[PDB]
Write a protein that binds this ligand. Structure first.
Ligand SMILES: *[C@@H]1O[C@H](CO)[C@@H](O[C@@H]2O[C@H](CO)[C@@H](O[C@@H]3O[C@H](CO)[C@@H](O)[C@H](O)[C@H]3NC(C)=O)[C@H](O)[C@H]2NC(C)=O)[C@H](O)[C@H]1NC(C)=O
Ligand SMILES: *[C@@H]1O[C@H](CO)[C@@H](O)[C@H](O[C@@H]2O[C@H](CO)[C@@H](O)[C@H](O)[C@H]2NC(C)=O)[C@H]1NC(C)=O
Ligand SMILES: *[C@@H]1O[C@H](CO)[C@@H](O[C@@H]2O[C@H](CO)[C@@H](O)[C@H](O)[C@H]2NC(C)=O)[C@H](O)[C@H]1NC(C)=O
Ligand SMILES: *[C@@H]1O[C@H](CO)[C@@H](O[C@@H]2O[C@H](CO)[C@@H](O)[C@H](O)[C@H]2NC(C)=O)[C@H](O)[C@H]1NC(C)=O
Ligand SMILES: *[C@@H]1O[C@H](CO)[C@@H](O[C@@H]2O[C@H](CO)[C@@H](O)[C@H](O)[C@H]2NC(C)=O)[C@H](O)[C@H]1NC(C)=O
Ligand SMILES: *[C@@H]1O[C@H](CO)[C@@H](O)[C@H](O)[C@H]1NC(C)=O
Ligand SMILES: *[C@@H]1O[C@H](CO)[C@@H](O)[C@H](O)[C@H]1NC(C)=O
Ligand SMILES: *[C@@H]1O[C@H](CO)[C@@H](O)[C@H](O)[C@H]1NC(C)=O
Ligand SMILES: *[C@@H]1O[C@H](CO)[C@@H](O)[C@H](O)[C@H]1NC(C)=O
Ligand SMILES: *[C@@H]1O[C@H](CO)[C@@H](O)[C@H](O)[C@H]1NC(C)=O
Ligand SMILES: [Mn+2]
Ligand SMILES: [Mn+2]
Lengths: 309, 563, 556
């Protein structure tokens, strides 16, 4: 596996071993030299299998995110990568003709999602991913945690458009009497005809629920004409303001959904959601700035040390 | 013990008892005005007399107490020399009525009484049933104002405020039809209100008396003229709230009459309706004998005679008012244009709607669980095959002559849940906003809210204690309104939180009933802690108002129509 | 003030009476079903004026009584409340000093177990219900074990009956009524006899006429007999208060007929207006705060106000309330209490003694007044004859002298009776008599708070707050202000406008009356217990007809 010294997996959301089933997982391939192997590179290939539960995410439909060249911070070509989607093997191929590499320090990472097949039947929590090389197996571990129901959270869902945002307000926080929400995002355009909310009390083992369309709740559209619990509702192209007054039960979750249509040439979206909760006996504010990503991503400026003969 | 008729072995005997109730509990003429049938017959008179007895025993303590604390109040005022200025009216309240009105009168109602924001916000809290938004094209401006005044007051015009859906109207001009008692005077005010874009506040614009020379006042008039205009409007609004709420008494009564004639006494819905209509059949007899009789308490204290007071709810009913479904919370407010962005902007603060929305939510949750527990499913054949329920609906729509009641046959649980929610909401919520402790705490607090005016309506712009009651008359107003309150509801376990907690209903209805009851007790515990904890923020406002309003506190109100 | 006979402005004088007759009308009876009450614009205006005067004249007493009630309750609770029956003295010792200045009756508390006090009350503090049993026209009410009768009386029921010595108070009509929830009541009949051995009027038996229908005697256990007396006094208090409604409503209708026929400058109308001062307040005020649902009657009495209001109308519907039937001697000898035709004489009839003195003074004044006014001239006073005809016709007055009124003695009779009611008969039943005699706890409770026994006692009597509330109401029936306001019976006819407006004979008569009632009032104010602990032959000092204490008008 040399010069691979380690293969790590963390959640892009938390930057740690705790993750949602919906998270981007940073799969990092650490490259180091501290013995004195020669690494037969360039010409040399390193094959690493990716477990079937991980998947590359393609956007646009025609671009393979696993195919890239990687450089030093100074710009020197080091290797290129390609993934076999039939055998699930990632190949690193150095770009240095019959020319021994003496030093190699860097990290190649990709962002993967968990497959549907795995997440339908997954259960919390700890899950290990098996990466096979030729002389070693790497088995980093991640805890598949249920939704955080102790504060307002934010969730992304890619759709044909297409981001559907979810803002969940847990009644198990207050005491909750008033809810204020505002979102700003660039470059998307909010569909003001598609703001809705639901209140559910069930929750599955991952803390989630699926509201039914007109137990789990029912999706209720939000228009100018709507009355309480809606206290106020402004929707512009880049911003939405929303307020709620009502009794959120201890076992209930309020879920607000707002759609954002995207241009086809958009790959990334900045989004913040400020949530202010009023609770009897004060005012607690939250900021939720997690971005939205459409494809598996990497960083080509990956290597800090590199030298050949 | 309470069951449906669907699978009852003794169904023929159950039918027989209903048929015998129908021979002895009859629809009689409307009393206390001309609205709704009042029960007569041997059984209807027995029920009427039982309720009057219960009411008699339940009024003694509060009446004696109120007279004692009125006598003390008057001794104090008299000893301090009486009223020399409008501020001495606070002597009427400070330190007094501690037993009659334990919660005291509205925090901020005396300190901030001249506030225009407090005068406009009352139409969205203390008496929220009269205000109505002006449609930009389907309604015309009621009266005109000098556009220079309108421009300096609102920074815009009546035309633009109208087209923008920012003008609201209170129309008490129908009281022009009545003549005050001698030595008493009264106007027929129309109040124009607007939503101000500069401050995002619902505010007073103009007041037109519609009597005499018919002046129009504005907050740009002299201080005493504008203050007196607000006092005249509050007089008309007090008359309105007290006499329109007769319908909050008589629409439930008629719905319960139709039910009693059709549902078995062992029907679970009959038991909950009986619980909510506790003592209800006392209000028309008692009111006719001591309140609206010649020289009764109304005549003693209010400006318009009892004959005019009694004529008003019959006139409303004759013009088509008092529909049952028409009165559902959102249906009513939407018909008046007060919910959402309705041909205009959204009201930033509607405290009655917010408190009402919470409480009705708790009641509706309970009623939903109660109906599901009785009929056993999810959001309906068991309802369709309950011939007693279907008879109730046919009876309501037919012989009982109930207006705007869901048509028979009743096919959806949601309909029954609407009916039961609306009844509980009237007896434990809507009534207590208009009547109960609300006049003494908010609607009839002196000096801004006098039951009668004691000096003639001005004919020019010049002006004061002369329109207001004297010390004895003021004590007598506070003493009557204190007698509409019931300080003992708490210790009697007759509060809105105990509405469904009657031991016989918990013993005879089934586990689902008791689980819905416990959830209702906890929900109204949350709501009552929220309301009792209310106080002023950093701008001196509570729910956007210069006074603390608590009329819908379920820990304070009774669950039934107690006065 | 002037007769129409020789009035120069007789035409305008008639015209004012036409106007009054058009605006002051007979309306439906209030406060029960007895007698018309005035409607019309002028009647509404007089009603409202009297109600306002009444409220103004009630302020002092009600405020005083409220604060004294709070004092009494604080002290009783701090002294540990009622443990013994003797603890009810806490209710009165050192309280109610301004609202009841004369105090409550001497001896009513110390001698409360006395059978002579209990029986002698029917001949003083409420003399309107006792009735002698005629030997052959009236039957015995119930049985009493002959053993008990012989041990008690040394004789037999039949011997007492035949010798005219059995007397009865029958309250069993109240069995028609159902007490308020949590309160109880009997329908008692009391049998009393004139003991020939000791020459005393004494109790013999009490029968509750409810439940198992027990009969108590003074030979029963101490608490059983005592509770019997308590139940009887409770019925008797109901009767006195509710039957005295007729003392209001019959004078009212006489004065309504008079107001529709006599000129305001007629001398009889000036005297009638003085006696009926504030009178039209009593039915509206009583309707609004006494007998309204949840008012002071409901708060205090065992029977609800609906049954209370029913009682005078029931009395009336059976021929009670006759004007002439109420004349003192006619009534007392209709009931066999006076007159040697009826049987052995009562050795002590305090009410008849004080009433005979007081009615003597009133009648002497009225006879001097009629003589001053008239001198023939009676029959030519067509306003007077209109009053008599009106009272017998439209006003529907019951047992009024028939028109035409011919003898002066008939007019003297009318005016004497009216004055006797507003200055005397009312105050025996109402005014301060309930708080001083008729409703003194623990012997005279407004309600019973325990079920009537079914076999042979704080559980029946009110608790601390309820006792204080009873003395508070009854103390608010008093008017401690009547002396300082110069409104006593001695001041009855000494109004300035009357003295000045009538004539010298009037003022002479008035000075005579002031002399007489001064004598009467000193006589009654000097009373006390003699060598055998008796006043007027009773174990307590009864003063309810004192002219220097009573008002001259139907004040509450
Ligand atoms: C208690 O009173 C109920 C209301 O009056 C009765 O309900 C009636 O019961 C009838 C028999 O069950 C129903 O008869 C229907 O019509 C004909 C009759 O000629 C039958 O053949 C039908 O099969 C029958 N069922 C149908 C059409 O589904 C009545 O329709 C029904 N009326 C109402 C208003 O529901 C109860 O029967 C009565 N119970 C007893 C024990 O007497
Ligand atoms: C009535 O109330 C007044 C004060 O409001 C009080 O002074 C009265 O007491 C009497 O007042 C008389 C003065 O008009 C005085 O002469 C008399 O001595 C006095 N008596 C007492 C016991 O205080 C109150 N009671 C009345 C007028 O009887
Ligand atoms: C009149 O009503 C008041 C208010 O309900 C009663 O006072 C309450 O009495 C109960 C009985 O034990 C106490 O538990 C409460 O603490 C009291 N509350 C207050 C605010 O004092 C009073 O007892 C009633 N009076 C009568 C005669 O029933
Ligand atoms: C309405 O009245 C309330 C109470 O009288 C006002 O609140 C007070 O404001 C003063 C000065 O702003 C403070 O010093 C007090 O501490 C406040 N009292 C409370 C209980 O908070 C309030 O300012 C008034 N509102 C308006 C708009 O005038
Ligand atoms: C005032 O009223 C009387 C009663 O109507 C008027 O007339 C006399 O009435 C008596 C009855 O007592 C008749 O017998 C007489 O015939 C009437 N007198 C006549 C007709 O002259 C009396 O006239 C009236 N006073 C005035 C000035 O008209
Ligand atoms: C009405 O009440 C009376 C007295 O309680 C009773 O005798 C009668 O049977 C009752 N009638 C009914 C309940 O129909
Ligand atoms: C004092 O109480 C009496 C009843 O006891 C009542 O009639 C009177 O109106 C009260 N006084 C005042 C000033 O309200
Ligand atoms: C009744 O009182 C009113 C008000 O003082 C007065 O205007 C009217 O003239 C009075 N009516 C009579 C008949 O005196
Ligand atoms: C006055 O007395 C009543 C009972 O008579 C009592 O409940 C109340 O607390 C008292 N008020 C004061 C201020 O002492
Ligand atoms: C009545 O009471 C008085 C005063 O307490 C006492 O002097 C007298 O002896 C008593 N009379 C009788 C007959 O007990
Ligand atoms: Mn009411
Ligand atoms: Mn009286």
């Amino acid at each position: 596996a040399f010069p691979i010294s380690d293969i790590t997996v963390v959640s892009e959301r938390t930057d740690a071993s705790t993750a949602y089933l919906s998270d981007w997982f940073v799969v990092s391939f650490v490259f180091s030299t501290a013995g004195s192997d020669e690494t037969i590179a360039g010409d040399a290939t390193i094959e690493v299998s990716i477990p079937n539960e991980l998947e590359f995410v393609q956007y646009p439909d025609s671009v393979d995110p696993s195919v890239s060249e990687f450089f030093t911070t100074a710009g020197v070509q080091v290797l290129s990568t390609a993934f076999d989607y039939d055998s699930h093997v990632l190949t690193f191929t150095f770009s240095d003709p019959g020319q021994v590499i003496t030093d190699l320090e860097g990290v190649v990472f990709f962002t993967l999602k968990l497959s549907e097949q795995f997440t339908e039947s997954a259960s919390p929590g700890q899950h290990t991913f098996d990466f096979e090389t030729s002389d070693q197996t790497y088995s980093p571990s991640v805890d598949l945690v249920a939704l955080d129901r102790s504060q307002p959270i934010k969730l992304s869902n890619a759709v044909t458009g297409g981001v559907e945002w979810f803002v969940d307000i847990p009644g198990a926080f207050g005491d909750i009497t008033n809810i204020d929400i505002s979102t700003v995002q660039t470059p998307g355009t909010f569909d003001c005809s598609e703001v809705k909310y639901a209140v559910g009390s069930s929750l599955n083992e991952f803390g989630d629920f699926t509201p039914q369309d007109r137990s789990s709740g029912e999706w209720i559209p939000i228009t100018p004409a709507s009355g309480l619990p809606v206290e106020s509702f402004e929707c512009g192209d880049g911003t939405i303001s929303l307020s709620f007054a009502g009794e959120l039960a201890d076992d209930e979750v309020l879920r607000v959904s707002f759609l954002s249509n995207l241009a086809d040439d958009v790959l990334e979206v900045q989004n913040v959601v400020n949530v202010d909760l009023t609770t009897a006996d004060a005012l607690t504010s939250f900021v939720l700035d997690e971005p939205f990503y459409r494809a598996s991503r990497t960083d080509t400026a990956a290597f800090e040390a590199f030298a050949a003969v | 013990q309470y069951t449906l008729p669907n699978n009852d072995p003794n169904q023929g005997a159950r039918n027989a008892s209903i048929a015998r109730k129908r021979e002895l509990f009859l629809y009689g003429p409307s009393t206390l005005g001309q609205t709704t049938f009042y029960p007569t017959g041997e059984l209807g008179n027995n029920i009427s007399a039982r309720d009057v007895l219960l009411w008699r025993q339940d009024a003694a303590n509060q009446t004696a107490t109120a007279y004692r604390e009125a006598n003390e109040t008057f001794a104090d005022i008299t000893s301090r020399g009486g009223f020399k200025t409008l501020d001495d009216f606070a002597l009427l309240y400070n330190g007094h009525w501690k037993e009659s009105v334990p919660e005291g009168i509205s925090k901020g109602m005396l300190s901030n009484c001249t506030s225009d924001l407090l005068f406009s916000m009352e139409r969205l809290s203390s008496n929220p049933y009269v205000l109505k938004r002006l449609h930009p094209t389907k309604d015309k401006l009621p009266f005109s104002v000098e556009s220079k005044v309108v421009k300096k007051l609102t920074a815009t015009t009546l035309e633009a405020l109208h087209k923008g859906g920012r003008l609201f109207l209170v129309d008490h001009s129908y009281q022009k039809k009545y003549t005050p008692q001698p030595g008493r005077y009264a106007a027929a005010c129309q109040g124009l209100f607007y939503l101000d874009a500069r401050s995002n506040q619902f505010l007073p614009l103009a007041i037109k008396t519609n009597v005499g020379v018919d002046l129009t006042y504005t907050p740009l008039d002299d201080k005493d003229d504008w203050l007196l205009a607000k006092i005249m409007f509050n007089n008309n609004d007090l008359f309105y709230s007290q006499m329109y709420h007769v319908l909050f008494h008589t629409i439930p009564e008629i719905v319960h009459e139709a039910a009693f004639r059709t549902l078995s006494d062992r029907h679970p819905v009959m038991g909950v309706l009986n619980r909510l209509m506790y003592q209800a059949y006392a209000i028309r007899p008692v009111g006719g004998a001591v309140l609206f009789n010649p020289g009764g308490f109304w005549d003693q204290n209010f400006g318009l005679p009892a004959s005019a007071a009694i004529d008003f709810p019959g006139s409303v009913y004759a013009q088509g008012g008092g529909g049952f479904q028409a009165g559902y919370l959102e249906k009513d407010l939407r018909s008046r244009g007060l919910i959402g962005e309705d041909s205009g902007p959204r009201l930033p603060h509607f405290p009655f709607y917010e408190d009402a929305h919470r409480l009705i939510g708790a009641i509706r949750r309970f009623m939903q669980a109660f109906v599901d527990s009785t009929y056993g499913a999810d959001d309906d054949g068991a309802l369709l095959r309950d011939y007693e329920l279907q008879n109730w609906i046919a009876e309501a729509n037919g012989p009982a002559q109930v207006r705007d009641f869901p048509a028979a046959p009743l096919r959806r649980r949601a309909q029954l849940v609407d009916v039961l929610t609306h009844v509980a909401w009237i007896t434990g919520g809507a009534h207590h906003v208009m009547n109960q402790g609300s006049p003494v705490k908010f609607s009839g607090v002196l000096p801004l809210h006098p039951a009668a005016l004691y000096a003639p309506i001005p004919t020019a712009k010049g002006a004061l204690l002369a329109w207001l009651p004297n010390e004895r008359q003021a004590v007598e107003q506070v003493s009557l309104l204190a007698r509409f309150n019931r300080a003992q509801v708490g210790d009697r376990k007759q509060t809105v939180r105990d509405a469904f907690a009657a031991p016989d209903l918990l013993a005879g209805n089934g586990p689902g009933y008791a689980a819905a009851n416990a959830r209702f007790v906890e929900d109204t515990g949350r709501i009552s802690r929220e309301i009792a904890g209310r106080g002023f923020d950093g701008k001196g406002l509570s729910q956007g108002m210069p006074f603390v309003w608590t009329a819908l506190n379920p820990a304070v109100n009774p669950f039934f129509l107690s006065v």
